[PDB]
Ligand binder design. Structure first.
Ligand code: NOS
Ligand code: NOS
Ligand code: NOS
Lengths: 285, 283, 282
């Protein structure tokens, strides 16, 4: 359960960070699939390894620490989160929650997140961007909701509503930007269902998920979104369709993370460009 | 998680309470959405803080109590202060008060809760008698009974057949009918969302299509513990809000309207429970 | 009280067992419903009580690893299972399967008792698992949650052909050619963490999710076996017809489940023996 994502600990992390950068983030960006280049494209960047932030949860990519990247992107002050805390890795709720709440105290108003997901919706193609317009939080329905435990009233209410969790205006903007930049055809909106993971969904599971009205399935993101919505950060989330979910037990096609990475790699340039352009048009200063 | 809800710990809590009161409750009541609590005759109000190894509620200036007394001539114990799983309470913490009730002599547990109305035919303030449930956390390996079975209390694999005693439901309906508010009463399937987030429109749509009538974040664990130890159950959801099914609507479930609709129906709900208890069969 | 199912701990346990037996099993069998007499059929057999295997999970009459030969093949039979509804950890469930891997197991055959959701199912039917819905898994209680043990498998295992189709085809042919093809179905097994039987509403929902049988086990081991590359054959004995009607008097009862399983145990044993008999030998 790392350090409790309470106001005390979150403030402490926040203040440590504020020592290290003069950048007050307006936008938090959770680097998921296809956003690896975005991270690297931050201007006047300050890079703060998780290992350099006391009480910040620790995650590593093959022994390399995740980083907090501060700077501007499309003229906007941002904090890019490079290194996420997936529940399938065993991370506790407080661990996932803390970075988001730190973002809150840091000044973040809008969280943008990407992920890789399997396309349940049969109209989806590989490489499609599915803007999350809603989610089904299977772990949350089953008592693994990231918010289970004492509510941190400092951050939000005991029973947050998740109405407009995926800010409809941000979604309208994102679609708009895709349309204007000639890749609206790649952009869909859909329901993202979280499979706790880390197993890919079996065909029966995919078939069930599809029947439940899920468009894409992934193993991430929702808990972050919940914490974000809980503390009043607006959320924009896109799933990169990194594979078409197999609904048929007899198919020899099988999901594999290498192809997920491949699709993320191939769509990273467009996704970055898209996020940069969305950000450029975020209504403010 | 402070104490395993086994026969020894439970017996100890029961025996302690029995020093504190001579009332042997036949009916255990858990009020989620009165007021009833208030109107129990000759009440002995025992704070949880007074009961060692009994779960203790979070504060807020309102510690929970076991209220013992008579309602409609019947001996009852009212549980004021519930332990909801979304709070991070453990299985043992939720189980124990119910098993305590068993030892104290509770034969019937009556529970109210607030729920989102999934069923489109429902309106705010409606009462949905639970006739069945979908225990999503239970299915997903968070069943309150997960762990060593406490044989003192019940079987390893409890059937949840007639879990919402059909006779109690029939009586409850009859009573609501006889008292001019039968039109408010429905029966349906309660699905537990572990919570504490309200359900997204997509979740509600999924829940509705799973055959769920109302959704809430409580009750089932208690019901499971009760049925496991053979307490009959009557449970009703007050539809404190209509679940929003599509993401377009401004919508928004809110604990405020929960308390509101709650209050609006609190005296009816309490009246109903009293009148039901009035007509329960008596040994 | 739970040792990580990592390569170190699993090797220690495997190596220990290897100093109690020289049977290198190629087939692991996990005794569920209808299995139990299976051990009797095992020849040149050594019983190894779990109590005798350091760091091996311990279970109620302590469970046993039974090594030996069945239908001309080296098998290890796991007698005594670790069910998540008992409170056992993922590591407890995972370790024996991973031990089997190290011991040389190529094929895991498993039976369980299940409620028959599919309305065409009869009591005592065999439903070969051809797929599953791991409700605990979707809900963040997947046995693999935690650091991926790379010695065993990949971070994100696919569950494609989890229920090896060739094993399933063989199983069916054996049933068909031995006069009980009519007892044999294939279906989707959904795991209810349990230990409560499914309410009528739940069964109804599960049926509508596309589930044929419901039980409280098996999937975790299947997931661990698929993760480390063990092929899986799994059969649910329909030990009761799930009740979908909340107005029904019929109810699941474990005594009956045990009774129905015990009744089919002989046929289930014969089936497994005959399947093994026909397994490709290299
Ligand atoms: O089809 C899929 N099912 C579930 N999660 C997926 C799928 N495709 C991509 N992801 C996501 O990408 C990584 C695993 O490859 C995970 O982090 C998961 O969230
Ligand atoms: O629409 C709903 N979804 C889930 N729980 C609800 C809903 N309406 C009422 N409750 C109940 O109200 C409390 C929070 O207000 C929760 O404890 C829940 O059980
Ligand atoms: O109808 C059922 N639902 C769930 N599990 C079942 C059912 N029938 C048999 N089992 C299995 O047998 C034991 C309980 O009797 C459990 O271990 C469960 O996995």
């Amino acid at each position: 359960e790392s350090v409790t994502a309470n106001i005390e600990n979150v403030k402490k992390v926040a203040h440590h960070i504020q020592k290290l950068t003069s950048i007050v983030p307006e936008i938090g960006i959770i680097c998921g699939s296809g956003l690896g280049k975005l991270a690297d494209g931050v201007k006047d960047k300050i890079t703060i390894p998780y290992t350099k932030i006391p009480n910040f949860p620790q995650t590593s990519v093959v022994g390399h620490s995740g980083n907090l990247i501060f700077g501007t992107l499309s003229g906007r002050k941002v904090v890019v989160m490079q290194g996420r805390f997936h529940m399938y890795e065993g991370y506790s709720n407080d661990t996932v929650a803390l970075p988001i709440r730190v973002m809150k105290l840091l000044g973040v108003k809008i969280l943008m997140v990407s992920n890789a997901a399997g396309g349940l919706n049969r109209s989806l193609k590989l490489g499609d961007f599915v803007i999350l317009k809603d989610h089904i939080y299977l772990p949350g329905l089953g008592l693994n909701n990231i918010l289970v435990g004492p509510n941190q009233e400092a951050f939000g209410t005991r029973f947050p509503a998740l109405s407009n969790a995926y800010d409809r205006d941000l979604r309208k903007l994102a679609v708009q930007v895709a349309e204007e930049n000639g890749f609206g055809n790649l952009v869909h909106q859909g329901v993202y269902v979280m499979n706790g993971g880390p197993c890919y969904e079996t065909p029966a599971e995919c078939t069930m998920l599809l029947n439940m009205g899920c468009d894409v399935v992934g193993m991430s993101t929702i808990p972050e979104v919940v914490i974000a919505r809980h503390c009043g950060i607006q959320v924009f989330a896109v799933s990169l369709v990194t594979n078409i979910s197999v609904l048929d037990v007899e198919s020899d096609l099988k999901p594999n993370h290498e192809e997920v990475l491949a699709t993320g790699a191939q769509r990273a340039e467009l996704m970055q460009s898209w996020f940069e352009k969305i950000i450029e048009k975020l209504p403010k200063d």
